[PDB]
């Protein structure tokens, strides 16, 4: 993972509680690939892997 | 640099292993 924190907009940038709260909120707002695939109706493995049969998964079922 | 001569391995033979191993020194 890679994390970038910017607390310039805050009144007190030197706030460890602000830092930890921002990191935890960013983690909370994260969806897993399994959840994303379940919401879309797709196979989770056919979203991050470069296999040519996966090309059929991004078309419309006809 | 100095080669490890492993002389501490020989110190284990100075413990009378026949008391517990019942003559492990010989062929078995």
């Amino acid at each position: 993972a890679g994390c970038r924190i910017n607390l310039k907009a805050t009144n007190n940038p030197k706030s460890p509680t602000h830092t930890v709260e921002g990191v935890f909120e960013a983690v909370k707002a994260l969806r897993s690939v399994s959840e994303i695939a379940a919401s879309r109706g797709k196979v989770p493995h056919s979203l991050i892997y470069n296999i040519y049969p996966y090309l059929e998964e991004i078309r419309r079922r006809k | 640099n100095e080669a490890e001569k492993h002389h501490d391995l020989h110190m284990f033979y100075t413990l009378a292993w026949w008391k517990l191993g019942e003559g492990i020194f010989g062929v078995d």
Binding site: H45, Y49, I51, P53, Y54 | -
Partner: protein
């Protein structure tokens, strides 16, 4: 396919492809790709699991392919050996100067024993006349291995497969 007019299942296609891939004969992967393209043009689903298993099975059957390829040259060498059978100064150099020679090794040394065993045992071409049933050299089975060791003058202590220590069972 032709007589009863049935559509083979994807499991049947997978079985045929895996059979041809596992078979070490020449053209096996060509026939496997023929089956795969038959699936593609007939609409049968092609799966990444199928592709991964195709790659893995081909890599595994590479061993059998290599064994058959070596068996061909083994048979050729045996024929050449039979044809040949049918047909039938240590310390001085070219100029004449005396040259150094290494001292004789200990006759009781295991290296000397190995050298004498290699020089005096039967040649590798007379261990087996007929080769294996399926394109592969004999000597993989324990019976053939024991026969070969006996012909070479060695009594195998591991007569059976179970008599091998099998270190993969170790838990500690």
């Amino acid at each position: 396919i032709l007589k009863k007019d049935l559509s083979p299942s994807r499991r049947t296609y997978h079985c045929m492809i895996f059979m041809h891939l596992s078979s070490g004969e020449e053209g096996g992967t060509a026939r496997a790709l023929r089956y795969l393209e038959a699936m593609e043009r007939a609409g049968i689903q092609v799966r990444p699991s199928l592709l991964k298993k195709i790659v893995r099975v081909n890599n595994a059957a590479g061993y059998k392919r290599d064994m058959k390829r070596r068996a061909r040259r083994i048979m050729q060498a045996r024929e050449e050996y039979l044809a040949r059978k049918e047909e039938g100064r240590a310390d001085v150099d070219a100029e004449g100067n005396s040259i150094l020679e290494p001292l004789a090794v200990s006759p009781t040394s295991t290296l000397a024993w190995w050298e004498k065993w290699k020089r005096e045992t039967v040649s590798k071409h007379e261990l087996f006349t007929e080769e294996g049933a399926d394109g592969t050299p004999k000597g993989e089975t324990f019976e053939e291995k024991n026969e070969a060791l006996r012909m070479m003058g060695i009594t195998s202590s591991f007569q059976t497969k179970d008599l091998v220590p099998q270190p993969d069972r170790q838990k500690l």
